[PDB]
């Protein structure tokens, strides 16, 4: 077609193995890379390669730019620009990262020295401790622009009689555990290579997911990564009833 | 029947029963019971003043009481309801519209030997069903596809063009030549070869030199008309032509079935007798067009997400305009959640079922503002793939076609904030006067595109193809039990032998359209939000529609 300013290339990535899809046929998998803005533009028109006849599947449409950068670069990102001195140009505009990127060693992330705050609900690197993160974030729009470490302990309960002492006790430990929270967060982050604020403490499957995904990307295997969905992303064949899967 | 007399003197029925007996039991009617006789004493005593020697009054009262029993079927014995019919009599001196779910729809079998529909008693009414009464019996699994084949073959054999005729497959076991017209299920044998199956038997099919009739879809699990030659050296029917059974309009279909009240709003039918009615249809067609264009019911764009904030804001802006002119009916359709809700083993966060409950509590806040829309509008709730009970098993996939309504436990006070709200199954039938509309929500175009026969050899054409296949096959599920399981005893819900007058067929994978075919109208709402635009369409029972957008 040549109409799109993208990069396509025939690839041999190892596909997943859905029980229904078993016929070998041939191999003509492709590796189309294309910026998301013109992808949204191409969503509009009827005729385009991504939506035409004889399309078997799209296999990694679920992964967001956030996940791509947190998996590729990591916490310790550095600039290998050289060429023309566009550091000022890079900082005034948005630094495009595809052309120039490198991931430096993160053996020591930070020698911590910074102020910490609180914000709690019982229905600057601030720590958000609320049952409803989304509601508090939406109600105060100014809360979005500040960096927050979101640690959520939820479902407060009351005996309905003499609740003042139990409120005091529930407040005391949350007041006094700040030194432990930050210490454990840094301890996990220094090995994890995920940035501190994106990472959560109780979240443990996320570490496994990122590590397994990036060590898979070291190989040619396809991720089948799927976001906030209980089923794997197999290209759309996963949306049909099958006896073996059942 | 009149008032203002002196006072209601009390008299014993012994001095009243002879007149009632002579008027009712002797001439027309019978069985004036003792309790019923005592009941008929009060109203005749209401105007008792200067009577039992008067002229017409008592005779006319008995005549009027007989009028109800000729009008209503009732029975023989007269019971304490005798006052209940006089309440109707004094009553004599919109409505008739209903929404029928999948479960409450009447069941009808078909006898091929008799060319007629036989009633099936509902197990809920007579069976105890205290512990397990919804569960089918194994015999339905054996007749599920036989019923489809009988209905389609009757229609094929009553077509005008056919009078070569369709031959049973086993009649081909000794022939070495000639031509045959075979009708049956297209599927794959357990060996992996394409085959055709009819109640008589089965045969393998060769597609190597087949020329299909373009204009529709050839998916496994549907009836197909085929033509070719049978070779006895092996067992193969070499195909030379392929088509689909022709469709039939409902006006010519009704006459064959008489005037059966399938979606009976005129009355109900039992194992004894059936119901038919013709004269009322003319007058109610008159009433449909009797300057009732004010009626206005609206189907929203499918797949609207409550958890998203922008969708909620757009819905508030839309209800802002809907408040001005309240729709007659408002159908909220599509999945109400953007993520399937399952057991959610992790309890650190709030449970997904509690989140489902909470997302149905913001609707009350957003709806309580607009009082008129509450006061004079009826809302119809359609489920979706990611609702509560189904997603607990399918995990967002599409499974059984008869999908039960949303549980009343997690949605309780939306019935209070709004006046008329009805929860309905995934396939439902709106009976509006002399009109039947079918509500169905699934992605049909994707499944058609994925599963095609692929014969070895502008986008709106696909919409016409989909409409023609769905309408000619006379069934909403032209698929085998493998692709989509079906509740065995509820399959009649999905069979369109009489073509509906108006069809609601929403598919997010297919662009919106407005097509007409043999006696029906097919509309496609879909994709509530698209290209930063929120769309919703209006339709009027006078066969005009409108599209209204609100960024």
Give an overview of the whole structure.
The structure is cut from a larger assembly and holds chains A (246 residues) and B (551 residues). With 246 residues, chain A is mainly alpha-helical. Chain A is built from 7 helices and 5 strands; from the N terminus they run ααβαβββαβααα. Chain A has a 3-stranded parallel sheet with strand order 3-4-5, with no helix packed on it. Chain A has a two-stranded antiparallel ribbon with strand order 1-2. Chain A is globular, with a radius of gyration of 23 Å. The two termini of chain A are 41 Å apart. By secondary structure, chain B is α/β, with parallel strands linked by helices. In chain B, strands 9, 10, 11, 12, 18, 19 and 20 form a 7-stranded mixed sheet that branches. Chain B has a 6-stranded mixed sheet with strand order 1-13-14-15-17-16, covered by helices on one side. Chain B has a 5-stranded mixed barrel with strand order 4-5-6-8-7. In chain B, β5 and β6 form a beta hairpin. At the A-B interface, loops of A face α15 of B. Chain A: DNA polymerase epsilon is a heterotetramer consisting of POL2, DPB2, DPB3 and DPB4.
What coarse outline of chain B follows from CA principal-axis ratios? globular
Largest interface: A-B, 21 and 26 residues
**Share of β-strand residues of chain A:** 5-15%
Secondary-structure element string of chain A: HHEHEEEHEHHH
What is the terminal separation of chain B in angstroms?
60 Å
DSSP helix count of chain A? Answer: 7
Radius of gyration of chain A: 23 Å
Outline the biggest β-sheet of chain A.
3 strands, parallel
Q: Which structural class do the helices and strands of chain B define?
A: alpha/beta
- Structural class by sheet pairing and helices of chain A: mainly alpha
* Annotation field: number of helices of chain B: 16
End-to-end C-alpha gap of chain A: 41 Å
Roughly how much helix do the residues of chain B carry, as a percent range? 25-40%
Question: What is the 3D shape of chain A?
Answer: globular
Largest sheet of chain B: 7 strands, mixed
Q: What radius of gyration of chain B results from the CA coordinates?
A: 29 Å
Helix share of residues of chain A?
Answer: 25-40%
User: How much of the polypeptide of chain B forms β-strand, as a percent range?
Assistant: 15-25%
Subcellular location (chain A): Nucleus
Subunit structure (chain A): DNA polymerase epsilon is a heterotetramer consisting of POL2, DPB2, DPB3 and DPB4.
Family (chain A): Belongs to the DNA polymerase type-B family.
Organism (chain A): Saccharomyces cerevisiae (strain ATCC 204508 / S288c)
